[PDB]
Ligand binder design. Structure first.
Ligand code: OH
Ligand code: ZN
Ligand code: ZN
Length: 239
């Protein structure tokens, strides 16, 4: 009995080690990893895995190197294709905590230049390559070679000064990272590094960058429809 990963994922989300995986589209999966906070519930963070022909692309690490190695084990077991590159979406632990695991696997890594400047100070590891964005927010294509379906956009400062977002061409999916929370969220999470003045505008900019994306994928909520974007901007309005 040798079903494909797609066939297996019809049963629903799949636990793998300490992670959870969910198929969002035929070649796109959401990875979820958890930070234990002693005496409280474990904090979930989501990223993406994209099968792009004969290679795999990753958006965001897990919280730690070990959890990120678990992601790479899942990819080997279920997809059995090489991981070419990763884009990581700001200098917080949930997004860049596992860079050492990616680098040791021979994966080429990319982050906002600002994320690469901030990370080492914070005890994290910079990505190998720096993305630069035009004033309009779109990544300068020269800094994002061979990204396949990934379309990288800097929406402005919000959740953090460096936060970036990723559309997946050929699908209904855009990844807001930690900028966007779902349409039922009571909180924007920890705003300690947030630009509270510009947050709402940056959430709006994300929605306007990916107008055809009907599935919004987020770090700290399950996937939602586009109402997540204006809900988040409403929660961020005049903080
Ligand atoms: O975060
Ligand atoms: Zn963050
Ligand atoms: Zn986050």
């Amino acid at each position: 009995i040798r079903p494909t990963i797609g066939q297996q994922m019809e049963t629903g989300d799949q636990r793998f080690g300490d992670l959870v995986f969910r198929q969002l589209a035929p070649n796109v999966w959401q990875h979820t990893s958890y930070l234990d906070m002693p005496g409280f519930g474990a904090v979930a963070s989501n990223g993406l895995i994209v099968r792009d022909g004969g290679r795999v692309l990753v958006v965001d690490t897990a919280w730690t190197d070990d959890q990120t190695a678990q992601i790479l084990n899942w990819i080997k077991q279920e997809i059995n294709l090489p991981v070419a590159l990763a884009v990581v979406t700001h200098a917080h632990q949930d997004k860049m905590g596992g860079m050492d695991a990616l680098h040791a696997a021979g994966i080429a890594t990319y982050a906002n230049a600002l994320s690469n400047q901030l990370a080492p100070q914070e005890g994290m590891v910079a990505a190998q390559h720096s993305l630069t964005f035009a004033a309009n927010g779109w990544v300068e294509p020269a800094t994002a070679p061979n990204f396949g379906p990934l379309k990288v956009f800097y929406p402005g400062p919000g959740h953090t000064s460096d936060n970036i977002t990723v559309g997946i061409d050929g699908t209904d999916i855009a990844f807001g990272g930690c900028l966007i929370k779902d349409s039922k969220a009571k909180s924007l999470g920890n705003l300690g590094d947030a630009d509270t003045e510009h947050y709402a505008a940056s959430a709006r900019a994300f929605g306007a960058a990916f107008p055809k994306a009907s599935m919004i994928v987020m770090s700290h909520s399950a996937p939602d429809s586009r109402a997540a974007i204006t809900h988040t901007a409403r929660m961020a309005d005049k903080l």
